[PDB]
Amino acid sequence: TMKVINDPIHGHIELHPLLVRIINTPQFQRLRYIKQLGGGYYVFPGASHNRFEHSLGVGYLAGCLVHALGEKQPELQISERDVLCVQIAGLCHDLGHGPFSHMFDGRFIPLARPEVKWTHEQGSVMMFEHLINSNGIKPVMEQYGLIPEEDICFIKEQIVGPLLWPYKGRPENKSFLYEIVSNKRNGIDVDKWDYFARDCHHLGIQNNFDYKRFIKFARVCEVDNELRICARDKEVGNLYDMFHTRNSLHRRAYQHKVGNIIDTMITDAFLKADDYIEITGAGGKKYRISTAIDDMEAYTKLTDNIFLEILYSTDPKLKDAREILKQIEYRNLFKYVGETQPTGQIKIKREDYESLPKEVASAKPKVLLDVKLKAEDFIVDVINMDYGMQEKNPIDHVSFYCKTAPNRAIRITKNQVSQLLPEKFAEQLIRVYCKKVDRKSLYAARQYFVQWCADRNFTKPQDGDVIAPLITPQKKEWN
Amino acid sequence: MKVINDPIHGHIELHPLLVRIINTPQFQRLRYIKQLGGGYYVFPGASHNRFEHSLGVGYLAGCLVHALGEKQPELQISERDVLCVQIAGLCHDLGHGPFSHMFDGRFIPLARPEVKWTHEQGSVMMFEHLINSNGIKPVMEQYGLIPEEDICFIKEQIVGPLESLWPYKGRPENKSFLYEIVSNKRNGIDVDKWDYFARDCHHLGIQNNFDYKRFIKFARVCEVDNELRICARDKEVGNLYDMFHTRNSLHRRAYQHKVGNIIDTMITDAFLKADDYIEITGAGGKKYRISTAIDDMEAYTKLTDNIFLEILYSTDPKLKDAREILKQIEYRNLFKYVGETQPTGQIKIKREDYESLPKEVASAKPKVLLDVKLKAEDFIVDVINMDYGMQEKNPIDHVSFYCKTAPNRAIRITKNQVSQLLPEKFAEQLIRVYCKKVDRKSLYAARQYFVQWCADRNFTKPQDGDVIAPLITPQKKEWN
Amino acid sequence: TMKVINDPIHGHIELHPLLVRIINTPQFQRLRYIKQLGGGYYVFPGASHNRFEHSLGVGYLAGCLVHALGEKQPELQISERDVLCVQIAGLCHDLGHGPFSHMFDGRFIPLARPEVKWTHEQGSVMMFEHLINSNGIKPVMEQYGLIPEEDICFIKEQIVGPLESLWPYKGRPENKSFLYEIVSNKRNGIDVDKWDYFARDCHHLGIQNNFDYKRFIKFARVCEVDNELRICARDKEVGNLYDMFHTRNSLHRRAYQHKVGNIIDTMITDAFLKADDYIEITGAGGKKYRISTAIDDMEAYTKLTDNIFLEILYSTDPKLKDAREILKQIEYRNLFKYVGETQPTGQIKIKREDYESLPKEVASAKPKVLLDVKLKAEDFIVDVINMDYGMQEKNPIDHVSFYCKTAPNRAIRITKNQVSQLLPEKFAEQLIRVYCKKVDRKSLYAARQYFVQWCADRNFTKPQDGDVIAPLITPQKKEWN
Amino acid sequence: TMKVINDPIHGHIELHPLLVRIINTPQFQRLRYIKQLGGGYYVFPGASHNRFEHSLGVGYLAGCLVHALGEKQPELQISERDVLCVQIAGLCHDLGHGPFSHMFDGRFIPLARPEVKWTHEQGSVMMFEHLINSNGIKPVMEQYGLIPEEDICFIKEQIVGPLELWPYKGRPENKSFLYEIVSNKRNGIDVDKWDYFARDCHHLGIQNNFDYKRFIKFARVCEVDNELRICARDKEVGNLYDMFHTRNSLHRRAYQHKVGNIIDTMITDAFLKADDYIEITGAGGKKYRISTAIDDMEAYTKLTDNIFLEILYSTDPKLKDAREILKQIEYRNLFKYVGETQPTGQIKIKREDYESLPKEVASAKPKVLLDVKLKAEDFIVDVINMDYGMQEKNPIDHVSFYCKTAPNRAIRITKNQVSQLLPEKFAEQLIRVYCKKVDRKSLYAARQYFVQWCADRNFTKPQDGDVIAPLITPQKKEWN
Ligand SMILES: Nc1nc2c(ncn2[C@H]2C[C@H](O)[C@@H](COP(=O)(O)NP(=O)(O)OP(=O)(O)O)O2)c(=O)[nH]1
Ligand SMILES: Nc1nc2c(ncn2[C@H]2C[C@H](O)[C@@H](COP(=O)(O)NP(=O)(O)OP(=O)(O)O)O2)c(=O)[nH]1
Ligand SMILES: Nc1nc2c(ncn2[C@H]2C[C@H](O)[C@@H](COP(=O)(O)NP(=O)(O)OP(=O)(O)O)O2)c(=O)[nH]1
Ligand SMILES: Nc1nc2c(ncn2[C@H]2C[C@H](O)[C@@H](COP(=O)(O)NP(=O)(O)OP(=O)(O)O)O2)c(=O)[nH]1
Ligand SMILES: [Fe+3]
Ligand SMILES: [Fe+3]
Ligand SMILES: [Fe+3]
Ligand SMILES: [Fe+3]
């Protein structure tokens, strides 16, 4: 029989025995100890939720969508084998997230090991392999009609994309299965649908996107010699609103100015603790926090725990790291100075991020300062907000259908929908903080910042006339 | 105090004066007017009526004014001011007609083109009638109000000024912020909106993305141009753009739903046909029609959604034309939706031209063999202005903000200071075409006329255009 | 294709073309103009919701449960024909409700026409027949694989029970008895009508619902019980099932039997009785029917809705002046005043026959207190209310079959003692509410004295507020100290 | 100014600067790392929520109730000092919970240190003292008008009851009602309950049937036996019985879930085995064990749910026994549930006898002479007392009520005055038996021992009893 489990977002989920068997392993249960929104918990006290339950929900929704397409269109010949594989992918899709989720792959690893190009997804594939092998799942897969050679490839391919038709796991006549868990074409996937619903529930924000409705009007059609998922013509509006909702959650919560500074402070403490923390891996080899990603037996033991390990330690080697985390407890965080954006079409390249604190201190504001501030006193956090496809409109990469001809796929441009939609689909936000907390240094920091904005032809800080009233009239373009 | 349980706002407390206003025919009337008119016939959850919206707006008006008072005693907001703001909120939609916006938005403009009449003007008149016919003036005095000054203040909250120095007679400039609570003429950020977002969502089955409670926590009165106004905190600017997005989104999904609108036009049509033969007893026994009941409030008190069922259940042969339209709604033989389109460039369609557009669609000569020719009376063309509440203007350019560092110093925040992902324009037009002939052959023809008419006037390609009229869409160079 | 419709309780419901065809008729759309909770709207301003949308939801849930049983147990051979019939029943199950729902079949018709035994359900069967015939549905049923002879009986049987020991149903055999337990469960009362209105009424009332129907469906299963295939719940759900009936009783206490909701219902009923004689409703062949007699002809009853309230209120006919004055008194909020509530003791049931006589008894009490005003029996209203777990004095859980994880085809019983000592001792009781038609301060004082005395006289329970409202009368009774 | 914080249950809470200052300390932030429902997370995957946010909410609701009583009844002379103190108590009320909340004070400490009588509350008082002293809060309290001598006593008294006629030193008899807000010793109706109902439901995926906001609207202080207490309105008596029903229902479904409890016993077991070899640095560097950290608050500050993962991730061979239990939880090789039963008549099982019950189950001689024999160490018998918070008493008999007609006159309402459908008793016991041997053969045996043991002690028939032990159930005359 089936196992039932009660998620507060999705209700009573049914779990196939194979899924239960995958779930009840150290590699998966690990996700109970990794928070979804990392440092966001330290701003939204509701956001205690962990990857474990996100992972169940993505598994659940993956099943819903593939099973729905099957009932509506038997011609597709979606097998119970295909359904199980899609569920397993959904279930295991975030297996490779590190401590504090996106803080790890987004802030820490890029600083700790700049040579590597590593992502949460690559980790998931590796950790999935480790889960299968270390728990004897392959026999159980066979028992329930799967073919490990073909299907383990298919599952991995659903997660990271491909390791003519680039996939070895399934033929072109089932390409639509690759658009369920992680949609490379346009980004409309069930990972999104779950975390919108889930993050909102815990954050204390209401979610404006109806995934259930999208499933009712979803359908597979032929597009360029390939069978893809298509939405109904009328849903085009709701799809633009899906990406709006996403961007809106990033603005309010995920990229919250203090959430991000807590993430940078935790990252900083990890960098300082890196050298002196050992994690036992395969064959007893010792791995560091930054190197545990190379061996999955070590990475299985690397969770949010590492924060409290550092905090509670008495090792004097970890004193520098422990002091940063103690400063978070007491709430002596680095102070937020302000936010700004580039103008024209000036993109700030990732290569230049290291240099920006130097530039802020280098500004010469025509105002008498109490204190001079060095470049090490500033932090400059650059954030790319987009609709998931850098500068592109993802709706231009969605296929639609009409009531009158439901097998005939079509495109819908932006002009066909509304003039009130966004003009661009990507931008950059630049947040500046100051490590010196006191009244005198904060005043100075504000002057350096608002000047630096004028110097580089950036947008006027929203509060700019208040924080630096002597600097804002200097720029002709701001009047 | 009386407590009452609204499913949106919880247990509301009602002041005795409010209870006394509520328990009158003029107010209880609102129990029999649906919030979303014809929308009930598309969203079966939307059974909710104006009565309960009216209570909630009254409630939120109290919340906001009471909150400003606690946070800023310097404003000297009196318990008299609070009561007046509550009364305005409570009575703000008193003048809605049968099926709410269908009445002031479709019916009255067709039935009586000479008049410029709104739900709000009706509210002021109906408020006056409520006060006089129920002896409220003594009760207002009993609770510290001054009817001369305050009844003006209440009416002014609802419709704006009753006639660039200070236009209000009800309160001085040092209390201008009170006029921004119930119906905000400056920018549109008011508690009417906050209630109906929450309420309509609850009943529609859509989730609401706007947190009014949060906005209240970061609201504050500051001096702006020699006048005390409500200001939001700098950080809320994003949430305010999202407020108007939420609004526009509710209009797109629900309020301007293609079938909701066609049901509204069909009910309006049946009212126009029934107008002449329905009498409503007014003041001194005078007889008023549906279209003329707005002139006398004793008559208008008896004009509700009932009028639909009165027509439907009637046996008078004079009402047969009207009754047949309403019977066609029951059976679901609605006028068929052909498609939607928009103008291009910045070519605005003037209101004067709306009458002429069915003629233009029939006048199109599509290069396709048609089974049926269709006359202009067979088409309906519904033009809809979607905006952020201030025609072509960005309402956030008319909001004052404040910073944590200087909370009495008001500032402005432009669009460029916030995000490049915000809208370029703040108004547009949608043109929906329907066909009165329902059959398979006429609908095909209608689609050809429509998609041609779109090409003829350099409008946008209908989303489904390549499917419904595949022989017409390649004709236009601009659509390839 | 399917039609999709967005209910705020259940989400996006799919409607089969046959159902759409049934929905889009005057007989069904009528339900848009009948409120679910009748006079409750005048106490809970959220409760604007109408039968129409309840009806859609019951149709939806009926589909969910039958479709779920089918997937989990193919051996049952549940056909797409069976599924459609169960949906149609669910959809049409409340078709026969009158103006203000339960006020009509529960208060008005019993007073207006005491000779008749009539219910909302009997009306539904009749109105279903009328819907089918007047809209040519029978051809459409055949088109989608139904057999009108057999299936229209099956649908009617789902609604009212048997149209009349052996197997009592003609619509389906004993090997599909479980289908009769979905829409209206005669065995124990666990049905999808309940599940929808809990969720729906709560949503609109502003009360939260403590019952998870989705969960019950996941652990539902058909087993053999006494040579008959019935729905069974899992052993562990027994607690949640007792809580289902608790939730029901709790909704009745808070909302449905609210003291003022009920007085508004009696006042509207009263106004209908006074308007009855002078309101004509055109029926079949032009014949004239009254409000009380429209139940006899469905073409008339199709036009009888909540409208009738506003028809009376807005009228100028002097024949309707008595009725119109009652409804105007509701607008102004001059309602009959609530005096208090009480219960019988021991095991003294008050028979329905005696309800007429109780106002006489209250006025007949001789309270040992100086009164300014004497009150006659016509001044009092006494409303008697039977609260139960749906099966008069019986525990409905004693009529539920259960199954275990270890043996899922073997049905069992679970007694009350096996579950908890904190469950109810009895499963039915009576509440007696007394109101006074005279509103003034002096008459209300008097009414309270008559009432609290009458309670002592008949060995009823002490009113909760009794020591306050009648402090000179409560020490008189030895049993209350 | 005020700090705003967004809790998903209560909305945007305002935090007074003094509260912020208390919140931002190691002793308080500690609560971020303790789960509300301990091992329940391993059954309800929604239940990730921690004490931190419960603590904020209780602080919030404490403010709501005291501030509401103040507005409705100025005669009480509730000061802004009183309000702050009530908030601080609410905020700090669960400061002393251990790893996995109630598992610690309810299972672990009673086994690890049977000599001691220790509770989460006693810990809170001690941890509150430590918080104040180690963070220099006393100056800040004074700055905002508090008097540390009197008020720190008042706060502690709100949490644990009297620290030693009128038993309280923190406030006089004319403010006794303040002691009924955070932790109500009289009847149990407090805001701790109100928060966790709402919160646990939100995260569990169960809906909550209790309206705390409504209760506040109809709450009021009256004189009762020469003392000013909180009273509810007469009509709320039903909703109050339903409050305790809701509580009992949450215990049945979630908190005392058969597997949640077995995971709690397994974690407790692993803690007992790890106790001796885990050192936690305390005050002056002294070494404390898990069981002894309760004696020194500097040590206890570092004792959180972490300790689970510390054991799990360790390589010390001294911790191998403990680490193996926790690894068995990961793999889901939990001790197997055999069944549940209750006593009959009025046979209470005394706490003294709990140790002996596994012996009794193995000692049963079922007449199906068994192919594997099981020893007493193979069985776990978990006894659970379900009540309405006051052992065998009806807590509604300890609530004072008032009537609309005389709102200062307090009264009592008995059970008979309300309903015959209420509970007969207000306490009972549940006995769950599990078996440590997991295999098919031992589980069969365990079931026979159990169902016999039930017959032997005249307990209730297990629900599944006829299925699991069909040879044993006809033996007992009383079960047919
Ligand atoms: N909504 C709700 N969820 C519940 C309830 N009880 C448990 N859950 C949640 C907790 C879990 O998330 C899920 C399963 O709990 P079980 O139904 O008790 N199933 P298990 O494996 O214990 O027993 P078996 O092997 O006997 O089937 O439902 C309840 O009454 N209500
Ligand atoms: N959530 C909830 N709302 C309720 C409940 N009971 C009533 N309401 C709703 C219905 C209404 O919206 C509101 C008032 O109903 P009452 O508090 O019962 N007040 P009334 O005027 O009858 O009592 P009096 O004159 O004796 O003061 O509460 C309940 O138990 N729960
Ligand atoms: N949640 C939600 N409900 C919606 C939305 N739009 C409509 N509804 C609700 C209202 C209705 O209950 C239902 C159907 O609305 P349509 O999807 O517009 N379908 P119709 O028959 O008009 O179009 P066709 O024949 O072209 O498919 O969904 C929306 O964006 N969101
Ligand atoms: N619903 C909602 N909650 C939000 C939002 N933004 C933050 N929160 C939540 C997160 C927090 O729980 C709370 C406050 O976050 P901030 O209002 O951003 N205040 P902070 O102290 O950063 O700014 P300052 O010191 O300048 O006043 O609201 C939002 O847009 N919406
Ligand atoms: Fe994910
Ligand atoms: Fe309004
Ligand atoms: Fe029903
Ligand atoms: Fe607590």
Numbering used by the authors:
A (entry chain B): 114 to 276, 284 to 599
B (entry chain C): 115 to 277, 283 to 599
C (entry chain D): 114 to 277, 283 to 599
D (entry chain A): 114 to 277, 284 to 599
Which passages does the manuscript contain on this structure?
Sterile alpha motif and HD domain-containing protein 1 (SAMHD1) is an important regulator of cellular 2′-deoxynucleoside-5′-triphosphate (dNTP) in mammalian cells. Although the HD-domain contains the active site, dNTP hydrolysis requires assembly of SAMHD1 into homo-tetramers. Here, sequences at the N and C termini of the HD-domain stabilise inter-monomer protein–protein interactions and incorporate four pairs of allosteric nucleotide-binding sites, AL1 and AL2, which regulate the enzyme through combined binding of G-based (AL1) and 2′-deoxynucleoside (AL2) triphosphates. Using combined biophysical and X-ray structural studies incorporating nucleotide analogues along with mutagenesis experiments we have now discovered that SAMHD1 uses a bi-metallic Fe–Mg centre to catalyse dNTP hydrolysis in a reaction similar to those catalysed by HD domains in both human and bacterial phosphodiesterase PDE enzymes.
Co-crystal structures were determined using either wild-type (wt) wt-SAMHD1(109-626) or a D137N-SAMHD1(109-626) AL1 allosteric site mutant that generally produced higher resolution diffraction than wt co-crystals. A further effect of the D137N substitution is that D137N-SAMHD1 is activated by xanthosine-5′-triphosphate (XTP) rather than GTP through AL1-binding but nevertheless maintains comparable catalytic parameters for dNTP hydrolysis as those observed for wt-SAMHD1 and GTP. We first determined structures of two co-complexes of D137N-SAMHD1(109-626) in the presence of Mg2+, which is required for tetramer assembly and catalysis, with (i) XTP (AL1) and dAMPNPP (AL2 and active site), and (ii) XTP (AL1) and dGMPNPP (AL2 and active site). SEC-MALLS analysis revealed that all four dNMPNPP analogues, which have an imido substitution at the α,β-bridging oxygen, when combined with GTP, support the formation of stable SAMHD1 tetramers, albeit to varying degrees. Near-complete tetramerisation was observed with dAMPNPP, while dCMPNPP promoted the least tetramerisation and dGMPNPP was able to support tetramerisation without additional GTP, presumably by occupying both AL1 and AL2 allosteric sites. Further investigation using inhibition assays revealed that all dNMPNPP analogues were actually competitive inhibitors of SAMHD1-dNTP triphosphohydrolase activity, with inhibition constants (Ki) ranging from 0.78 µM for dAMPNPP to 0.052 µM for dGMPNPP, with the following rank order of increasing affinity: dAMPNPP < TMPNPP < dCMPNPP < dGMPNPP. The resolution of these structures varied between 2.0 and 3.2 Å, but all structures contain highly homologous “closed” tetramers of the SAMHD1 catalytic domain, with pairwise root-mean-square deviations (RMSDs) of <0.5 Å across all atoms in each tetramer.
